[PDB]
Write an enzyme that holds these catalytic residues in place. Structure first.
Site, PDB file in Angstrom:
ATOM      1  N   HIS A 236       0.807  -1.221   0.000  1.00  0.00           N
ATOM      2  CA  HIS A 236       0.000   0.000   0.000  1.00  0.00           C
ATOM      3  C   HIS A 236       0.839   1.269   0.000  1.00  0.00           C
ATOM      4  O   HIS A 236       0.318   2.348  -0.250  1.00  0.00           O
ATOM      5  CB  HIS A 236      -1.020   0.012   1.143  1.00  0.00           C
ATOM      6  CG  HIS A 236      -0.428   0.243   2.506  1.00  0.00           C
ATOM      7  ND1 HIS A 236      -0.261  -0.770   3.435  1.00  0.00           N
ATOM      8  CD2 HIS A 236      -0.026   1.383   3.125  1.00  0.00           C
ATOM      9  CE1 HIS A 236       0.214  -0.256   4.561  1.00  0.00           C
ATOM     10  NE2 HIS A 236       0.376   1.044   4.394  1.00  0.00           N
TER      11      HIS A 236
ATOM     12  N   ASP B 196       0.348  -7.773   1.559  1.00  0.00           N
ATOM     13  CA  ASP B 196       0.643  -6.329   1.657  1.00  0.00           C
ATOM     14  C   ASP B 196       2.147  -6.074   1.738  1.00  0.00           C
ATOM     15  O   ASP B 196       2.616  -5.420   2.673  1.00  0.00           O
ATOM     16  CB  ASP B 196      -0.131  -5.608   2.771  1.00  0.00           C
ATOM     17  CG  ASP B 196      -0.130  -4.096   2.608  1.00  0.00           C
ATOM     18  OD1 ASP B 196      -0.675  -3.410   3.513  1.00  0.00           O
ATOM     19  OD2 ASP B 196       0.402  -3.572   1.604  1.00  0.00           O
TER      20      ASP B 196
ATOM     21  N   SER C  88       4.267   3.185   7.764  1.00  0.00           N
ATOM     22  CA  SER C  88       4.002   1.974   6.980  1.00  0.00           C
ATOM     23  C   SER C  88       5.220   1.570   6.190  1.00  0.00           C
ATOM     24  O   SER C  88       5.820   2.394   5.501  1.00  0.00           O
ATOM     25  CB  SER C  88       2.894   2.221   5.981  1.00  0.00           C
ATOM     26  OG  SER C  88       1.633   2.068   6.589  1.00  0.00           O
TER      27      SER C  88
END
Lengths: 227, 227
Positions: A65, A94, A173
């Protein structure tokens, strides 16, 4: 009559993270191998920023992402830009792997064994696309987490994750959760919506399968914009 | 006061398609090079079926949405399955190119010049994932169509399309619109929502840019499930 509330066990309560971890010698030693990722995503009308880390020479791991929907990805190390190619992209687990020619810093090693409840750990990343920041953290639990993939596709995914006690910030992230040995326990990807001081980390074991594609060289797509 | 309805010019009215086109000798001659595509898409809880066509030996063009979200793609020619690899995937233009080793049928050629309003043309494909079907059609107009990409990403796309008068059926996506010379005018991708007898076709010119990647050999992803 069976009553119909929904219940779940709470995230494991643990002590507040040790604030002194920001100054632990492991932070400065690991920093060079923790990189900032900037992805131009005109399809999404956004610039995406996150974190990654060196997993092998000229190879960087991040979350899918962090690059989803983008058409240009740059890695920054030592305040210098490096062109990157997305050579593996998995929106279910992911994780993305970037090929980054001539990237100076050395790789980090994945920890061989799982972390235990209450362990001192550190989230490393670039909140807000800004300066490198170490975020003190504490392991709550290793769990099997079920939920949608990054696109909200019909079929849910089940992944091994750590829950941590930490204040995970936008831009973290893709960064590593490290132990005090400087080894990577997993990849920080999210924060709880309703549980304020809780972060979510893909375990080293969960992301290990992605390494089978580390020898890839050709670009793969970056899929859809995350909604 | 300026009044605030929205208006647009109607699709160009044209005569009903010639039903005899189903028996035009071009249909049987072109059929071997028009293939059925079946894509297993467990992420989407679906099996996707559409059409493609041979663009060069061992290379098949279809729409991106015919393979979007899938993890296995099979091409059927002459009632035989062939393994395929998605080597180019563009969800903005909505085109995918498949590498299909040892695929027997020959390629079709893209028409060198645009089609004209009222021209007899034929949609070739596999409605419902069933038998090969020729659908009589008539060109309405070449237009520049703006709208969302297949994922509904934020930034719209603008593409050269034909509008046609035809009854386009589910399963026709990815098939060629051919002229009476057996050359490909474009790739059939959609039907009007409110205008019953209207189909939409990407022009040959619109898809031409995809051919720059025809030499690709490595798999690229298939992105998100179409909503």
């Amino acid at each position: 009559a069976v009553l119909e509330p929904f219940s779940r066990t709470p995230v494991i309560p643990v002590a507040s993270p040790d604030p002194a971890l920001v100054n632990n010698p492991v932070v400065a030693a690991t920093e060079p191998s923790v990189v900032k990722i900037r992805s131009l995503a005109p399809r999404c009308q956004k610039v995406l920023e996150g974190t990654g880390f060196v997993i092998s020479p000229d190879r960087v791991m991040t979350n899918a992402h962090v690059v989803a929907g983008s058409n240009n990805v740059t890695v920054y190390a030592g305040d210098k830009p490096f062109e990157a190619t997305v050579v593996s992209y998995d929106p279910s687990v992911d994780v993305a792997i970037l090929a980054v020619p001539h990237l100076p810093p050395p790789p980090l090693v994945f920890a061989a064994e799982p972390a235990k409840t209450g362990a001192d750990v550190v989230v490393l990343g670039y909140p807000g696309g800004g300066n490198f920041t170490a975020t003190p953290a504490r392991i709550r639990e290793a769990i099997r987490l079920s939920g949608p993939d990054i696109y909200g596709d019909p079929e849910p995914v089940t992944r091994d994750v750590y829950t941590i006690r930490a204040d995970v910030e936008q831009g973290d992230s893709g960064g590593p959760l490290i132990d005090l040995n400087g080894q990577v326990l997993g990849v920080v990807f999210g924060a709880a919506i309703d549980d304020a001081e809780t972060g979510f980390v893909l375990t080293a074991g969960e992301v290990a399968g992605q390494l089978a594609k580390i020898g890839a060289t050709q670009p793969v797509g970056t899929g859809a914009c995350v909604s």
